[PDB]
Each structure stands twice: as C-alpha cells, then as structure tokens.
C-alpha cells in the first residue's frame, strides 16, 4: 500500500499523490470525506 494498493481500494492515488500533500482540494474531502 504504497506501490499501488494503497489505491486501487483506497483510491488514494489520483488522491494519495496529489492530495497526497494537500492538492486535489480533497477529492471531495475523501481523507476527511473518507475519514473515520
């Protein structure tokens, strides 16, 4: 989860890797949308 799992369910790519810093703007907050 850091090669690309860490996306295909956590879609933290186009997310963790761009949002990954604080870009994306959130997709749709998803890490605060996405959050706990």
């Given at each position: 989860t850091r090669?690309?799992?860490r996306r295909p369910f956590h879609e933290c790519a186009?997310?963790?890797?761009i949002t990954d810093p604080g870009?994306?703007?959130r997709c749709i907050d998803m890490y605060c949308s996405y959050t706990n």
């Open positions: 090669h690309s799992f186009l997310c963790y890797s870009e994306r703007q």
